[PDB]
Design a protein around this motif. Structure first.
Motif, PDB file in Angstrom:
ATOM      1  N   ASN A   1      50.154  66.945  76.194  1.00 13.93           N
ATOM      2  CA  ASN A   1      50.573  65.687  75.582  1.00 13.93           C
ATOM      3  C   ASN A   1      49.972  64.474  76.289  1.00 13.93           C
ATOM      4  O   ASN A   1      49.477  64.576  77.421  1.00 13.93           O
ATOM      5  CB  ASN A   1      52.100  65.566  75.573  1.00 13.93           C
ATOM      6  CG  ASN A   1      52.698  65.526  76.967  1.00 13.93           C
ATOM      7  OD1 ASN A   1      52.306  64.709  77.807  1.00 13.93           O
ATOM      8  ND2 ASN A   1      53.667  66.401  77.217  1.00 13.93           N
ATOM      9  N   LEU A   2      50.034  63.325  75.617  1.00  8.41           N
ATOM     10  CA  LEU A   2      49.472  62.100  76.156  1.00  8.41           C
ATOM     11  C   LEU A   2      50.085  61.576  77.453  1.00  8.41           C
ATOM     12  O   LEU A   2      49.495  60.712  78.110  1.00  8.41           O
ATOM     13  CB  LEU A   2      49.475  61.001  75.088  1.00  8.41           C
ATOM     14  CG  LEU A   2      48.339  61.053  74.057  1.00  8.41           C
ATOM     15  CD1 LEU A   2      48.235  59.703  73.379  1.00  8.41           C
ATOM     16  CD2 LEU A   2      47.008  61.370  74.735  1.00  8.41           C
ATOM     17  N   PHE A   3      51.264  62.064  77.827  1.00  7.54           N
ATOM     18  CA  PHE A   3      51.847  61.628  79.098  1.00  7.54           C
ATOM     19  C   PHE A   3      50.844  62.123  80.133  1.00  7.54           C
ATOM     20  O   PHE A   3      50.290  61.359  80.929  1.00  7.54           O
ATOM     21  CB  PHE A   3      53.196  62.308  79.376  1.00  7.54           C
ATOM     22  CG  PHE A   3      54.355  61.702  78.643  1.00  7.54           C
ATOM     23  CD1 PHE A   3      55.084  62.452  77.738  1.00  7.54           C
ATOM     24  CD2 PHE A   3      54.743  60.398  78.893  1.00  7.54           C
ATOM     25  CE1 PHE A   3      56.188  61.918  77.096  1.00  7.54           C
ATOM     26  CE2 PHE A   3      55.855  59.850  78.252  1.00  7.54           C
ATOM     27  CZ  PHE A   3      56.578  60.617  77.351  1.00  7.54           C
ATOM     28  N   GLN A   4      50.607  63.428  80.088  1.00 14.43           N
ATOM     29  CA  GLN A   4      49.698  64.075  81.005  1.00 14.43           C
ATOM     30  C   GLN A   4      48.321  63.444  80.921  1.00 14.43           C
ATOM     31  O   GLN A   4      47.631  63.354  81.937  1.00 14.43           O
ATOM     32  CB  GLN A   4      49.631  65.564  80.683  1.00 14.43           C
ATOM     33  CG  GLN A   4      50.996  66.152  80.355  1.00 14.43           C
ATOM     34  CD  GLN A   4      50.956  67.636  80.067  1.00 14.43           C
ATOM     35  OE1 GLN A   4      50.111  68.116  79.303  1.00 14.43           O
ATOM     36  NE2 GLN A   4      51.884  68.373  80.664  1.00 14.43           N
ATOM     37  N   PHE A   5      47.919  62.992  79.731  1.00 15.25           N
ATOM     38  CA  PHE A   5      46.596  62.382  79.598  1.00 15.25           C
ATOM     39  C   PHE A   5      46.540  61.066  80.346  1.00 15.25           C
ATOM     40  O   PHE A   5      45.500  60.711  80.897  1.00 15.25           O
ATOM     41  CB  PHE A   5      46.193  62.158  78.129  1.00 15.25           C
ATOM     42  CG  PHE A   5      44.773  61.657  77.964  1.00 15.25           C
ATOM     43  CD1 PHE A   5      43.748  62.147  78.779  1.00 15.25           C
ATOM     44  CD2 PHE A   5      44.467  60.680  77.030  1.00 15.25           C
ATOM     45  CE1 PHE A   5      42.449  61.667  78.672  1.00 15.25           C
ATOM     46  CE2 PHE A   5      43.164  60.193  76.914  1.00 15.25           C
ATOM     47  CZ  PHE A   5      42.155  60.691  77.742  1.00 15.25           C
ATOM     48  N   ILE A   9      43.860  60.786  83.624  1.00 15.98           N
ATOM     49  CA  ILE A   9      42.872  59.698  83.608  1.00 15.98           C
ATOM     50  C   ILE A   9      42.887  58.936  84.938  1.00 15.98           C
ATOM     51  O   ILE A   9      41.835  58.595  85.486  1.00 15.98           O
ATOM     52  CB  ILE A   9      43.154  58.643  82.517  1.00 15.98           C
ATOM     53  CG1 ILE A   9      43.199  59.283  81.134  1.00 15.98           C
ATOM     54  CG2 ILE A   9      42.064  57.577  82.557  1.00 15.98           C
ATOM     55  CD1 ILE A   9      43.574  58.304  80.041  1.00 15.98           C
ATOM     56  N   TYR A  51      40.271  68.020  70.527  1.00 15.51           N
ATOM     57  CA  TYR A  51      41.536  68.586  70.070  1.00 15.51           C
ATOM     58  C   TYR A  51      41.370  69.357  68.775  1.00 15.51           C
ATOM     59  O   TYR A  51      42.062  70.333  68.524  1.00 15.51           O
ATOM     60  CB  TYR A  51      42.584  67.483  69.882  1.00 15.51           C
ATOM     61  CG  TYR A  51      43.100  66.900  71.178  1.00 15.51           C
ATOM     62  CD1 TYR A  51      42.945  67.586  72.385  1.00 15.51           C
ATOM     63  CD2 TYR A  51      43.762  65.676  71.195  1.00 15.51           C
ATOM     64  CE1 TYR A  51      43.433  67.070  73.584  1.00 15.51           C
ATOM     65  CE2 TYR A  51      44.261  65.143  72.394  1.00 15.51           C
ATOM     66  CZ  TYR A  51      44.088  65.847  73.590  1.00 15.51           C
ATOM     67  OH  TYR A  51      44.540  65.328  74.787  1.00 15.51           O
ATOM     68  N   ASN A  58      49.167  72.496  68.843  1.00 11.53           N
ATOM     69  CA  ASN A  58      48.876  71.069  68.722  1.00 11.53           C
ATOM     70  C   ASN A  58      48.684  70.437  70.108  1.00 11.53           C
ATOM     71  O   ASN A  58      49.367  70.788  71.063  1.00 11.53           O
ATOM     72  CB  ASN A  58      50.013  70.368  67.963  1.00 11.53           C
ATOM     73  CG  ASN A  58      49.783  68.868  67.808  1.00 11.53           C
ATOM     74  OD1 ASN A  58      49.870  68.108  68.775  1.00 11.53           O
ATOM     75  ND2 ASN A  58      49.486  68.437  66.585  1.00 11.53           N
ATOM     76  N   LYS A  60      48.993  66.958  71.079  1.00 13.97           N
ATOM     77  CA  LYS A  60      49.844  65.838  71.483  1.00 13.97           C
ATOM     78  C   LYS A  60      51.258  66.186  71.945  1.00 13.97           C
ATOM     79  O   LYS A  60      51.845  65.459  72.744  1.00 13.97           O
ATOM     80  CB  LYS A  60      49.921  64.813  70.348  1.00 13.97           C
ATOM     81  CG  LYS A  60      50.014  63.369  70.812  1.00 13.97           C
ATOM     82  CD  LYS A  60      51.297  62.710  70.352  1.00 13.97           C
ATOM     83  CE  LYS A  60      52.459  63.016  71.275  1.00 13.97           C
ATOM     84  NZ  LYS A  60      53.760  62.630  70.662  1.00 13.97           N
ATOM     85  N   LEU A  61      51.811  67.288  71.454  1.00 17.88           N
ATOM     86  CA  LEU A  61      53.165  67.662  71.836  1.00 17.88           C
ATOM     87  C   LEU A  61      53.200  68.786  72.860  1.00 17.88           C
ATOM     88  O   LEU A  61      54.273  69.166  73.343  1.00 17.88           O
ATOM     89  CB  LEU A  61      53.974  68.088  70.605  1.00 17.88           C
ATOM     90  CG  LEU A  61      54.174  67.098  69.459  1.00 17.88           C
ATOM     91  CD1 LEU A  61      52.903  67.031  68.626  1.00 17.88           C
ATOM     92  CD2 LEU A  61      55.350  67.546  68.587  1.00 17.88           C
ATOM     93  N   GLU A  63      52.771  70.421  76.420  1.00 14.24           N
ATOM     94  CA  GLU A  63      52.762  70.191  77.851  1.00 14.24           C
ATOM     95  C   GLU A  63      52.085  71.405  78.470  1.00 14.24           C
ATOM     96  O   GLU A  63      52.435  72.554  78.174  1.00 14.24           O
ATOM     97  CB  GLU A  63      54.191  70.085  78.401  1.00 14.24           C
ATOM     98  CG  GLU A  63      55.033  68.948  77.842  1.00 14.24           C
ATOM     99  CD  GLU A  63      55.329  69.081  76.361  1.00 14.24           C
ATOM    100  OE1 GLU A  63      55.963  70.068  75.957  1.00 14.24           O
ATOM    101  OE2 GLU A  63      54.933  68.190  75.592  1.00 14.24           O
TER     102      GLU A  63
END
Lengths: 122, 122
Positions: A1-5, A9, A51, A58, A60-61, A63
């Motif tokens: 997910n984007l948290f991890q992204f 970064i 992706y 998926n 984005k969701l 982890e």
């Protein structure tokens, strides 16, 4: 997910070094058209276009399990789908690193007068 | 794509969903981990599944046709997939509209310590 992204970064760059991709150019964050504007942007494209290769789960969701050891995002996970995703964040996070110098604020929060080009496909 | 999706929320809720929603609850922006914190959230959550299930095309890349005519948002692509990415964003911007009052200015620009929880399946 984007948290991890957001997390990955930052590892090569500085903490919170991601607000500048929430909306940057044609692909970084809100966007998705008109071909890149520079190296940075492409990473945001190659990352998008990454992706889509994810067979199954998926991006984005999901982890994934990962650890940042001595400056190396090691994706240690026993699930090809999940591992994959991690790798889309590893390759990209490393991308933007080196490309934070071609950076130009004048590619921030943009619309359809810069990305109306012949929209390059993955 | 988001370019397209932002202009849709921004056409049901004032003039710039890009922000409040760039990082809200657990599933609105740069996140996607845990359980929906409220209306706006159950929305941002339900949006990404909607996106997820579209397996035929690329929701993040798809450039669909739409129009805001009469105060109603209509989708104009026949391509059964392109007609979906739109329907998802469409509904999304109606979801974010009728719940703008539940918006808790205390949930934007979220961490993940508050979402490190289970990324509910969908």
């Amino acid at each position: 997910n984007l948290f991890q992204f957001a997390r990955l970064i930052d590892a090569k760059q500085e903490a919170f070094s991601f607000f500048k991709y929430i909306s940057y150019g044609c692909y970084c964050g809100w966007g998705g058209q008109g071909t890149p504007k520079d190296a940075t942007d492409r990473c945001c494209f190659v990352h998008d276009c990454c992706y889509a290769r994810v067979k199954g789960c998926n991006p984005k969701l999901v982890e994934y399990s990962y650890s940042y050891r001595t400056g190396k995002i090691v994706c240690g996970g026993d699930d090809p789908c999940l591992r994959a995703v991690c790798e889309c964040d590893r390759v990209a996070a490393i991308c933007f690193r080196e490309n934070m110098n071609t950076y130009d604020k004048k590619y921030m929060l943009y619309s359809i007068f810069d990305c109306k080009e012949e929209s390059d496909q993955c | 794509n988001f370019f397209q999706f932002a202009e849709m929320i921004v056409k049901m809720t004032g003039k710039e969903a890009v922000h409040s929603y760039a990082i809200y609850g657990c599933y609105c922006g740069w996140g996607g981990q845990g359980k929906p914190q409220d209306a706006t959230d159950r929305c941002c959550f339900v949006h990404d599944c909607c996106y997820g299930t579209v397996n035929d095309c690329n929701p993040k890349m798809a450039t669909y046709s739409y129009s805001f005519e009469n105060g109603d948002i209509v989708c104009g692509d026949n391509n059964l997939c392109l007609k979906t990415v739109c329907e998802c964003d469409r509904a999304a911007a109606i979801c974010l509209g009728q719940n703008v009052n539940t918006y808790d200015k205390n949930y934007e620009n979220y961490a993940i310590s508050h979402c490190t929880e289970e990324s509910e399946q969908c």
